[PDB]
């Protein structure tokens, strides 16, 4: 715009450890599906997103835990009629690491979750105007932290 | 289209729905004037915004009651700006309200002001700026939302 | 980083170099007051913006000379908004200036005002809004740019 | 609202009302492949975009006819980006089409390609980025618009 040839986006977060393998999907035009895994005794594990990109699906990279034992869930949204209006969860320590222990996704149609352990410090991000269009974060044994790209 | 510019709004935090207020969006923030009671919650709320390099004095949004302690948060705009807003929500006399607020800038932390009990919330901003507030105030700040931009 | 909100800006049209002006960005446009001369170019330029539902009177940016004809463009904000800005640039007394302007809204066309000779320019807006003007005025409007948003 | 993000779009330039196309918006531009004829107008048009740090190959939008000369505009992304797009529109075989295009970056000028006669247009960008193209191509590029963002 004035420095780089790369577009910018509002980003909120991170929630979780304040600094696993870092990831950054970047920003897209919407969200079609979220694939995550969790363990009821620990925290969030795997995280993957199928985005919308100008009216067609774009399959995000799978960001995988270093360990197994998680329960997978597929959140398939009725895109574009259905979209996320609130993301909430919990952070807290597992084996001495601050991690994202639970996630819940509220859309204009229903609530998905919570997934994981609803113990620790709550966080929540309601969106009154705008859309979540991207995720970044880090995953080791568990999801360490994450941030969200927001746009109009 | 609507003929009016639109911006990302996050929130509300607080009661899920006093007198509603909506400052709209500006260029940045110069000063926040709020009041609080250490037994109850946040009371009055008022903001001096930046508007294209000049101050714009926002309306004073006032609680229906008094007894609050005022505080003035004067930012060194534009080198100083808010990078995280946090606080607590919980019930006061049966009403869900914003019990405390804290504002962290790239320079220091203002607060927490109010009662630090209830459900915590926090909004860190990795990329972007807060440029406006809206919400509702009765006896106390019932809820609030924030305008975000690049 | 900057602590100040950012907006897309397109332009400038005119001289690629008077007294510079920059209104910054607002919520929308309520009224444009400009002056022109049918043998030279655009002279004075002033805008009443919308700012979160209330009018905001921009500074009057005036030519160094007189002899211009004023026109007031009062828009039915917010149902009426600009969807295309067009005009001409060309030399006057050796200076590259904005010689004419026309504003097309979703309701009507205002103009062209001034001299319709030289190099045409036009900015149709398929999605978005003009929310601010900047430029420079000496004897005539030397150049101008526009703030664009959603 | 809808579940789909939106961006500023300026245009169209060209015929006002072939096969329509719309690439949508991305995070930048890496390469433009177009074709032209120095007797007629712009023909084929294709873009390699940036999508979050990786190339995204846009569909090739093709003229119904041949006889065009291809050109590859390979930008040093992200150091190099477009700061002005300009061209001409005018009648070819009775159709209003985009007769020429030129792309100015912060490093160099590419073009003009095609026929530089008719009505000029130009879009300088003072702040922001072009991140997508849409339009229509028959025998020639009928019109086009550009997605703009910060």
For chain A, give every domain's residue range.
1-152
Query: Alpha-carbon dihedral of residues C75, C146, B149, B136, nearest 10 degrees?
Result: -20
Rounded Cα–Cα distance for residues D8 and C124 (Å): 11
Elucidation method: X-ray
Residue whose tokens read 């655009």: C42
For residue A69, give Cα distances in angstroms to A40, A119, C147.
10, 19, 53
Give first-to-last CA distance, chain B, whole Å: 22
The topology (CATH level 3) of D1-150 is Vitelline Membrane Outer Layer Protein I, subunit A (2.100.10)
Does B125 touch chain C if contact means CB atoms closer than 8 Å? Answer: no
Strands of the sheet with A44-53, listed across from one edge: A56-59, A44-53, A30-38, A71-76
> In chain C, helix, strand, coil percent, each to 5?
0, 65, 35
The beta-strand segments (E) located in D37-128 are 42-51, 54-57, 69-74, 82-92, 95-105, 109-114, 119-127
Contacting residues of D for C127, CB less than 8 Å apart = 6-9
**Cα–Cα distance between B12 and B63 in angstroms, integer?**
18
CB contact, 8 Å: A7 with chain D? yes
Whether the CB-CB separation of D70 and D46 falls below 8 Å is answered with no
Distance from C73 to chain A by nearest Cα, in Å? 30
Distance of CA D135 to the CA centre of its chain: 8
Number of other residues whose CB lies within 10 A of the CB of residue A18: 10
Interface of B with C in 56-85 (CB under 8 A): 56, 77-81
Provide CATH code, domain A1-152.
2.100.10.30
Name the resolution in angstroms.
1.8
Q: How far apart are CA A30 and CA D62, in angstroms?
A: 28
Does the distance separating the beta carbons of D9 and C127 come in below 8 Å? yes
Nearest CA in chain C to B50: C4
Integer Cα distance of A103 and A16 in angstroms: 12
Instruction: List the C28-36 sheet strands across, edge first.
Output: C54-57, C42-51, C28-36, C69-74
**Closest partner residue to C145 among D6, D9, D126, by Cβ?**
D126
Breaks (C-N over 2.5 A) in chain B follow: 17
- Measured from the Cβ of residue A36, the count of other Cβ atoms closer than 10 Å reads 24
The verdict on D122 touching C (C-beta cutoff 8 Å) is yes
The Cα angle at residue C46 between residues C43 and C51, in degrees rounded to 5: 160
Q: Is A3 on the interface with D (CB under 8 A)?
A: no
Give the integer Cα–Cα distance in Å for D91 and C37.
32
Residues 6 or more apart in contact with residue C10 via CB below 8 angstroms: C123, C145, C146, C148, D10, D123, D124, D125, D126, D128, D148
How far is it between the farthest Cα atoms of chain D?
46
Q: Which residue of A has its CA nearest to C7?
A: A1
Decide if C16 touches A, using CB distance below 8 A. Answer: no
Burial of D64 (0-12, 13-18, 19+ CB in 10 A): exposed
- Chain D contact for C116 (CB, 8 A cutoff): no
C partners (3+ CB pairs within 8 A) are A, B, D
Mark yes or no for CB contact D148/C149 under 8 Å: no
């Amino acid at each position: 715009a004035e420095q780089s040839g790369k577009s910018q986006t509002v980003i909120v977060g991170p929630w979780g450890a304040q600094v696993g393998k870092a990831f950054d999907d970047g920003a897209f035009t919407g969200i079609r599906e979220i694939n995550l895994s969790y363990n009821k005794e620990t925290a969030i594990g795997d995280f993957q997103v199928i985005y919308d990109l100008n009216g067609s699906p774009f399959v995000g990279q799978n960001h995988t835990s270093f360990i197994t034992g998680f329960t997978p869930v597929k959140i398939s949204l009725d895109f574009p009629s259905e979209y996320i209006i609130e993301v909430s969860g919990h952070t807290g320590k597992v084996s001495g690491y601050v991690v994202v222990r639970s996630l819940a996704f509220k859309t204009n149609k229903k609530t998905y979750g919570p997934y994981g352990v609803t113990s620790g410090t709550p966080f929540n991000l309601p969106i009154e105007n705008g859309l979540i269009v991207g995720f970044k974060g880090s995953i080791g044994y568990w999801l360490d932290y994450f941030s969200m790209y927001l746009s109009l």
